């Protein structure tokens, strides 16, 4: 009979009330700078979607980050460029300084502000319980801003949180998968990294919204406070839902399926089984108790929900008791 429709419950119509140029990135006109403004210094890593380099702007001798874009539809490039341009100056959003194209190889490249190459996956065992709360809050700042701007990130994971610990600086990067949210649009589900893929993606429910970023945040939170990385470690996209179900239980999984009238892959028919919902206490142990509290546990539970609509929004998360002393200290 077809899936049941769904609307985001915050920032639902933000993009409708913008000029078309705001979200119609397909017609955006890129103005290209000169790639001879920059000399590449060293490779910073990454693959698949790009190759990232540290680079010097010869004009001001200031360090810069250059993402050579790997061949993909021109519109996906315009999309990322326009989302970046739209989010420029947002709290903890990476800042685009320029766009250039190889003189010969016509390959486009994005030039970014520099931040000290340390992302969130490393920096791990050095994080205290207050550090987790402070960096989680900083990520929520960036998530709530882009959401309020009609944009969902869709690849939230530790490799995409850059941090300068010495200055408590954090930047949400990689906007290459980000989309504008439009009420009633059916989105591609092959986004995100497996361990951070929301259930909606795994059961092919396409009318999803910002709350997908909140699931992915929940996955990060869990692996940190429990010191199990990743927390849902599935061997593929299908087994990734089974891992989730072994923890959230199958009762709620199937109520979600029913509520939105989702037709499940006949596959899953044989692998999901019956699984109670576990109490978070079962993942607590002596090496991570110092990171677990009633506050963290309450907050985590409120992010990891099958039903994308019962997950906390960014702004609700930011008001959770979990963040009280970071909210206090920051003022």
Q: What's the rounded Cα separation, in Å, for the pair 243 and 234?
A: 6
Nearer to ligand A1IVT, 80 or 209 (CB): 80
Size of the site for ligand A1IVT (CB under 6 A): 24
- Smallest gap from Cβ 45 to ligand A1IVT, in A, equals 7
Q: What's the rounded Cα separation, in Å, for the pair 111 and 82?
A: 14
Nearer to ligand A1IVT, 10 or 68 (CB): 68
48 marked ligand binding residue? yes
The set of residues, in sequence order, having a beta carbon less than 8 Å from that of 266 and lying 6+ positions away, is: none
Q: Which of 144, 155, 174, 209 is catalytic?
A: 155
Q: Residues 14, 52, 81, 312: which binds ligand A1IVT (CB under 6 A)?
A: 52
Q: CA separation (Å) from 136 to 80, 125, 141, 322? A: 24, 16, 9, 10
Q: CA separation (Å) from 93 to 24, 171, 220? A: 21, 5, 18
Nearer to ligand A1IVT, 109 or 317 (CB): 109
Nearest residue by C-beta to ligand A1IVT? 174
173 binds ligand A1IVT (CB under 6 A): yes
- Smallest gap from Cβ 296 to ligand A1IVT, in A, equals 28
120 binds ligand A1IVT (CB under 6 A): no
Phi and psi at residue 108, to the nearest 5°: -75, 150
User: 28-59: buried (b, 16+ CB within 10 Å) or exposed (e) per residue?
Assistant: beeeeeebebbeeeeeeeeeebbbbbebbbee
> Which string of DSSP letters, residue by residue, matches 145-171?
HHHHTTEE----SGGGEEEEGGGTEEE
43 marked ligand binding residue? no
100 binds ligand A1IVT (CB under 6 A): yes
Q: What's the rounded Cα separation, in Å, for the pair 230 and 235?
A: 11
Site string for ligand A1IVT, 125-164 (x = CB under 6 A): -------------------------------------x--
Catalytic (active site) residue 155: yes
45 marked ligand binding residue? yes
Q: What's the rounded Cα separation, in Å, for the pair 30 and 11?
A: 27
Helices and strands (H, E) in the chain, number of each type? 10, 10
Task: Return the active site residues.
Answer: 155
- Interface residues with ligand A1IVT (CB under 6 A) are 35, 38-40, 44, 46, 52, 55, 65-68, 94, 100, 102, 109, 111-112, 114-115, 162, 173-174, 176
Residues annotated within a binding site? 44-52, 67
């Amino acid at each position: 009979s077809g899936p049941v429709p769904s609307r985001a419950r915050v920032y639902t119509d933000v993009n409708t009330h913008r000029p078309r140029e705001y979200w119609d990135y397909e017609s955006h006109v890129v103005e290209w700078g000169n790639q001879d403004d920059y000399q590449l210094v060293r490779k910073l890593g990454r693959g698949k979607y790009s190759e990232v380099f540290e680079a010097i702007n010869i004009t001001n001798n200031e360090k810069v980050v250059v993402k050579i874009l790997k061949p993909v539809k021109k519109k996906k490039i315009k999309r990322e460029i326009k989302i970046l341009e739209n989010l420029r100056g947002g709290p903890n959003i990476i800042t685009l300084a320029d766009i250039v194209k190889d003189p010969v190889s016509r390959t486009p490249a994005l030039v970014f502000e520099h931040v000290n190459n340390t992302d969130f996956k490393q920096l791990y065992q050095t994080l205290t319980d207050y550090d987790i709360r402070f960096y989680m809050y900083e990520i929520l700042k960036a998530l709530d801003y882009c959401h309020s701007m009609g944009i969902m990130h869709r690849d939230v994971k530790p490799h995409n949180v850059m941090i300068d610990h010495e200055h408590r600086k954090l930047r949400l990067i990689d906007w290459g998968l980000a989309e504008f949210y439009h009420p009633g649009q059916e989105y591609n589900v092959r986004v995100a990294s497996r361990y951070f893929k929301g259930p909606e993606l795994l059961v092919d429910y396409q009318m999803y919204d910002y709350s997908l970023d909140m699931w992915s945040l929940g996955c990060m939170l869990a692996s940190m406070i429990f010191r199990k990385e990743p927390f849902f470690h599935g061997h593929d996209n299908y087994d990734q839902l089974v891992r989730i179900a072994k923890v959230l239980g199958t009762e709620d999984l199937y109520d979600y399926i029913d509520k939105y009238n989702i037709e499940l892959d006949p596959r899953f028919n044989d692998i999901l089984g019956r699984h109670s919902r576990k109490r978070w206490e079962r993942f607590v142990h002596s090496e991570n108790q110092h990171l677990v509290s009633p506050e963290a546990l309450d907050f985590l539970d409120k992010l990891l929900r099958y039903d994308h609509q019962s997950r906390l929004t960014a702004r609700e998360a930011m008001e959770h008791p979990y963040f009280y002393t970071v909210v206090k200290d920051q003022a």
